[PDB]
Write a protein that binds this ligand. Structure first.
Ligand SMILES: [Mg+2]
Ligand SMILES: [Mg+2]
Ligand SMILES: [Mg+2]
Ligand SMILES: [Mg+2]
Ligand SMILES: [Mg+2]
Ligand SMILES: [Mg+2]
Ligand SMILES: [Mg+2]
Ligand SMILES: [Mg+2]
Lengths: 105, 62, 271, 115, 71, 86
RNA sequence: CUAGAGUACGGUAGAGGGUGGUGGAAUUUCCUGUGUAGCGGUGAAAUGCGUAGAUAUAGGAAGGAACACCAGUGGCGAAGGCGACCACCUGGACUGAUACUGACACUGAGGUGCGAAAGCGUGGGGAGCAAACAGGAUUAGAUACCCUGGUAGUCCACGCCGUAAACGAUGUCGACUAGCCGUUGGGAUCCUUGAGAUCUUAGUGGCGCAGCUAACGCGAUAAGUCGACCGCCUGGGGAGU
């Protein structure tokens, strides 16, 4: 419970991420997990090359879902070429919105 | 990494920057594999020398 | 896997591979047909492949290798023993009848999978084209031509790894260690072949090989010069000639590949 | 053939110094080593040999121009900085000096210790 | 007293649960090459040094900070 | 063991007290944890460091059962037959 | 009866374990482009690798293990031991208030487990390192120290092995005995800005009085003062044979 999944997609696929966010969150809602934030940090340059690219599109997301949606998202990112990196996390607390993008601009 | 403005100033800034960043003593510590016993020897000896210095300086601070 | 007590001289080193997941007899009769035992003899009657003879009566299983049925989910009924293979076979049941035998993956005990196209890319046993799978996956039963059927990695415990994809070919590393390019539209099955414990086995006695169908093999040094190139001599001769096949082919370390048609499809030789 | 704004690579071991002049594509143009200057011994490891090799490499590089250089120093041995002072003496504008060094985070274990 | 004020730092404010997102704060504790600075230079408490190292490593995995000047 | 699972055992084997001190509660909690941990070590066979904790709980349970036998036999039997031990 | 011991409730810190996935520096192998005479190595040399285009340099592919900096007399674990990040289960220790069990405790001959490293059995894996082994040099001689190669092994799954300077050369548990200076993490009082101050626990370090010691030297983490239990020693070789 109370995950903070962060994943970044290919720069060429940044246009399609709007539908992908809903495509992933619909399964979480079907499982029964509410989503507390959905932030798109935008296009930024990487600190190093990941499969010979330098841009990406970070997508921040925090979820409170059972073990089934966790496994669903653990498998969906693996079998995708758009998603190049991911990091599932765990926090024993709630979620507040608008963390740092206001300061990052 | 050092950019450029006389050349001697750049040379000295490169030499000092490399020493401050490291990557010159570490290379010298990559030419022979010290066993973890020898590595714990460094940790014991440096700790003894650093803790002893903190007490020896107090004698000067009397 | 079990071990036999030395009750008799023949049981001292018998290592059996027992399983309780196999069904107790009664195979699906419609998918069985008779097979005669060749004995290593072609239509001329001459022995071509020697060291074959005897054995036990067996029925050939119509094992499905194409998996042409796409989209229809399938449910496993049971896993059965296949006399003419080292791996186990699983009996399927699609949404409307049409029971089939396939090479059982490591998935067992009434699993459900859909041999289809781009559907269900996760579970092992799913057959799909080689183009739409992630690199680095382990596959088995790889066909070399479209519609021919699975050819490579069908024995027990065998598999192959995906390593690259470019153009119409998808390179993969075989279990032998030989890199090979295969066409992208060729189907393959995710996972590993079931009976990985086959390598841990000891037949135990001389008679254990005779009901496998293999006839005893006789060395060349125990023959006369007329029979074998190694020939006879006085005492236990040291095989004074170089090691050689009965028909005069070098045995210890001589290449014998002369295809010269499919060499372009091989990236790296096994070494 | 004319190329400008090359990259100078310096590989300085404990027994030799190798100087190579390249471009942004990393294509070799002129290379010189301390052993080729004719030292072959304890004199080979001195930083003066790195200066002789560096200035010899800086003479064949003028065949293609290269009025601007980028220096990449590499290795712990002597002549790490002495070779750099032998570059601009030949009349090259050195834009930047960069430390490139293989530093394993854990890496393979190195050889055994001498006795 | 530059090392002394840095323990405050993290300790004076209610920022105990730091995050791997605040690059503006993380960059102050990373040297020019990219390696993370020690604790005796910044003077931060050992608890917050360990908490800050994990955040630096997470930001490194997310390619938000570099490892070395090589790339 | 979850908080609610502890609370359910406490409410079940409460000795008309409203408190969690008695051996009937302690042995019950230890037995519930021991039964739960059985499936963990069938998956993780080499987890020897966590194996040490289970033996500590088993020894504490056997000590508490001996103490309970040292005071009353009816209470000892009513717990052994109810938890399925010995 | 609650002072020992244990249970219930919050909250911390952790390279504490096991099952999977994913990272980037570096080494080696292979392919390709540029380029040309050495490279490598040593007290100094040689063996070796080189115009069959090496070393160096740039682009790409595969694979194995270790996890810079953080990093500390730092932390956890009964010990051995444990350093990349993430998910999964999972043990114990720590600090606070309240409620309860009401001696339920300590030790422990036999026995039952956990065992660094090496080693062995079956199956995989093969980057580096390196027993054995080959060559070169030094050497009266050199099986060695030095250099170039290099197999088992070092890695993974299951099983066996019971040994180490397995060290704090100090068995476990409980209580009293001047102080000073650090540090790990947890709470209290405190003017309130603190780079804050004092006390108190659970660890981890440096000095030090009384006491002990043959002396070195321990000295609230005693080798001081006392209690419970266990193990062990009786001159050196012979012989842990
Ligand atoms: Mg029939
Ligand atoms: Mg034969
Ligand atoms: Mg034979
Ligand atoms: Mg004969
Ligand atoms: Mg005869
Ligand atoms: Mg003949
Ligand atoms: Mg002993
Ligand atoms: Mg001893």
């Amino acid at each position: 419970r109370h995950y903070e999944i962060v994943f970044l997609v290919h720069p060429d696929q940044s246009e399609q991420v709007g539908g992908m966010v809903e495509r992933y969150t619909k399964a979480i809602e079907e499982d029964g997990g509410k989503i507390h934030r959905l932030e798109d940090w935008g296009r930024r340059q990487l600190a190093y090359a990941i499969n010979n690219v330098h841009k990406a599109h970070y997508v921040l997301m925090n979820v409170e879902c059972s073990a089934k949606a966790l496994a669903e998202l653990e498998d969906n990112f693996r079998y995708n070429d758009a998603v190049i990196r991911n990091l599932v996390m765990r926090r024993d607390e709630a979620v507040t919105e608008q963390s740092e993008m206001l300061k990052a601009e | 990494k050092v950019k450029e403005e006389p050349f001697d100033v750049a040379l000295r800034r490169f030499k000092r920057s490399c020493e401050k960043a490291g990557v010159l003593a570490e290379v010298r510590s990559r030419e022979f594999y010290e066993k973890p016993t020898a590595e714990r020897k460094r940790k014991a000896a440096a700790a003894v020398k650093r803790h002893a210095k903190k007490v020896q300086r107090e004698q000067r601070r009397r | 896997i079990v071990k036999c007590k030395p009750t008799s001289a023949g049981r001292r080193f018998v290592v059996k591979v027992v399983n309780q997941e196999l069904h107790k007899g009664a195979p699906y009769a419609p998918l069985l047909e008779k097979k005669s035992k060749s004995g290593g003899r072609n239509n001329n009657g001459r022995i071509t492949t020697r060291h074959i003879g005897g054995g036990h009566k067996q029925h050939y299983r119509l094992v499905d290798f194409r998996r042409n049925k796409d989209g229809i989910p399938a449910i496993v009924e049971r896993v059965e023993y296949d006399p003419n293979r080292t791996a186990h076979i699983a009996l399927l049941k699609y949404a409307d009848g049409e029971r089939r035998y396939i090479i059982a993956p490591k998935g067992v005990a009434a699993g459900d999978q859909l041999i289809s196209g781009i559907g269900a890319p996760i579970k092992a046993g799913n057959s799909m084209p080689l183009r739409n799978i992630p690199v680095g996956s382990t596959v088995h039963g790889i066909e070399l031509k479209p519609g021919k059927g699975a050819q490579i990695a069908r024995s027990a415990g065998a598999s192959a790894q995906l390593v690259a994809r470019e153009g119409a070919y998808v390179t993969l590393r075989l279990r032998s260690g030989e890199m090979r390019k295969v066409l992208a539209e060729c189907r393959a099955t995710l996972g590993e072949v079931s009976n990985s414990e086959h390598s841990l086995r000891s037949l135990g006695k001389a008679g254990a090989t005779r009901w496998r169908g293999v006839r005893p093999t006789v060395r060349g040094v125990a023959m006369n010069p007329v029979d074998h190139p190694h020939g006879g001599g006085e005492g236990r001769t040291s095989a004074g000639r170089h090691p050689v096949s009965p028909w005069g082919l070098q045995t210890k370390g001589k290449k014998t590949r002369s295809n010269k048609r499919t060499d372009n499809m091989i990236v790296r030789r096994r070494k | 053939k004319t190329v400008v704004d090359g990259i100078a690579h310096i590989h300085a071991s404990f027994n030799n110094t190798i100087v190579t002049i390249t471009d942004r594509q990393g294509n070799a143009l002129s290379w010189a080593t301390s052993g080729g200057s004719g030292f072959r011994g304890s004199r080979k490891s001195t930083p003066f040999a790195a200066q002789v090799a560096a200035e010899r490499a800086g003479q064949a590089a003028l065949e293609y121009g290269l009025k601007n250089l980028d220096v990449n120093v590499k290795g712990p041995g002597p002549g790490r900085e002495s070779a750099v002072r032998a570059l601009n003496a030949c009349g090259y504008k050195i834009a930047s000096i960069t430390d490139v060094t293989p530093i394993p985070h854990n890496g393979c274990r190195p050889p055994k210790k001498r006795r | 007293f530059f090392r002394r004020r840095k323990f405050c730092r993290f300790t004076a404010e209610g920022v105990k649960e730091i995050d791997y997102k605040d690059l503006n704060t993380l960059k102050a504790y990373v040297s020019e090459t990219g390696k993370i600075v020690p604790s005796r230079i910044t003077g931060t408490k050992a608890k917050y040094q360990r908490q800050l190292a994990t955040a630096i490593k997470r930001a490194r995995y997310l390619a938000l900070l570099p490892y070395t000047d090589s790339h | 063991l979850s908080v609610e699972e502890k609370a359910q055992i406490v409410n079940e084997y409460k000795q008309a007290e409203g408190d969690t001190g008695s051996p009937e509660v302690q042995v019950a909690l230890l037995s519930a944890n021991i039964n739960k941990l059985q499936d963990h070590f069938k998956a993780n066979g080499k987890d020897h460091h966590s194996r040490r904790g289970l033996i500590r709980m088993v020894n504490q349970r056997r000590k508490l059962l001996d103490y309970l036998k040292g005071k009353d036999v009816s209470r000892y039997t009513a717990l052994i037959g109810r938890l399925g031990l010995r």
